[PDB]
Design a protein around this ligand. Structure first.
Ligand SMILES: CC(=O)Nc1ccc2ccn(-c3cc(NC4CC4)n4ncc(C#N)c4n3)c2c1
Length: 326
């Protein structure tokens, strides 16, 4: 069987908490009053919800309402408990209310989000460093609180650019970290899935989020969205291997005694590790620095144990100007 793994940091944060902190199956949902909100317009669909802008008629606040499609009680309880545990944490979306009427609806703080397809193409070198640092504050916080996001991606990072305001949203896939637990690998968007998910290594941890973050950083500095563009989950690992190289991949598989799907055998092939420089062009060079590439290299690792922690990432030279300015 596969060799076990433990998070390097925040390993036992939940084991030290009272049971109720992480035992979300026992959680009793506190329902607010549905009549306090009126929907204004549809914002879009998720996997298991439709999202609206609304008004709290009680206080004239703009809010966001996520009306749940049918999902198991325990999955709703998990997201609620996590949002409550993290509330007040840096750049974590605030869950403001939970209502019903027999469908449950989560009510969030509204972020005046700048279009992800527009905003990203205006960002300067400084902006990317600044917003990356803001995401790292949210990830260090949630990790320190015993929670993996497991769905870090551009769509789940709301930025009100005028106010330099960022929030990490959509904690619907997040889970509590418990050492030894075998997690579901069927999480995250294709392009952002960590190698652990793609090879079916279940004993993963907070470090998953750091891979996803590295994918975001690469797509921003190189202006290549998505960065790792797979055709499916199998081809996704191939796309990663054509950049990181196959030697390190097979080293990771050996170290954890992972059983690789036989399918993969015929498709991974043999690939050198590429230098980052092949992704730099006249369009993106203003975003790309030695610091950026050093930081990126230390997030995008097969071996989850070798990736930077959120807290370590915050100390990287890439952020020195940002840290001084704050
Ligand atoms: C709520 C959730 O987890 N899922 C989700 C899924 C789809 C959409 C589509 C739009 N949203 C938004 C749009 C904006 N702001 C307005 C300017 C566009 N915000 N501001 C704050 C949240 C939250 N939470 C939000 N959500 C979604 C959220």
């Amino acid at each position: 069987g596969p060799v076990p793994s433990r998070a390097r940091v925040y390993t036992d944060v939940n084991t030290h908490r009272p049971r109720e902190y992480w035992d979300y199956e026992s959680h009793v949902v506190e329902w607010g009053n549905q009549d306090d909100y009126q929907l204004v317009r549809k914002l879009g669909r998720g996997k298991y919800s439709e999202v609206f802008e609304a008004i709290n008629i009680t206080n004239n606040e703009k809010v966001v309402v996520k009306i749940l499609k049918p999902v198991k009680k325990k999955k709703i309880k998990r997201e609620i408990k996590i949002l409550e545990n993290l509330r007040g944490g840096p750049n974590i979306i605030t869950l403001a209310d939970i209502v019903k009427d027999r469908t449950p609806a989560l009510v969030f703080e509204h972020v005046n989000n700048t279009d992800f397809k527009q905003l990203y193409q205006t960002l300067t070198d400084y902006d990317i460093r600044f917003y990356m640092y803001e995401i790292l504050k949210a990830l260090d916080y949630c990790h320190s609180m015993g929670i993996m996001h497991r769905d870090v991606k551009p769509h789940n990072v709301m930025i009100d650019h005028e106010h330099r305001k960022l929030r990490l949203i959509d904690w619907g896939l997040a889970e509590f970290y418990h050492p030894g637990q075998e997690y579901n690998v069927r999480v995250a968007s294709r392009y952002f899935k960590g190698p652990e998910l793609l090879v079916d290594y279940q004993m993963y941890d907070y470090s998953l989020d750091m891979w996803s973050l590295g994918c975001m950083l690469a797509s921003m500095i190189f202006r290549k969205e998505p960065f790792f563009h797979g055709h499916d989950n199998y081809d996704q690992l191939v796309r990663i291997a054509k950049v990181l190289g196959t030697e390190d991949l097979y080293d990771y598989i050996d170290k954890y005694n992972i059983e690789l799907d036989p399918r993969f055998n015929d498709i991974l092939g043999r690939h050198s590790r590429k230098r980052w420089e092949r992704f730099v062009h006249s369009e993106n060079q203003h975003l790309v620095s030695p610091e950026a590439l050093d930081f990126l290299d230390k997030l995008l690792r097969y071996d989850h144990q070798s990736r930077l922690t959120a807290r370590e990432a915050m100390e990287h030279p890439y952020f020195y100007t940002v840290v001084k300015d704050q």
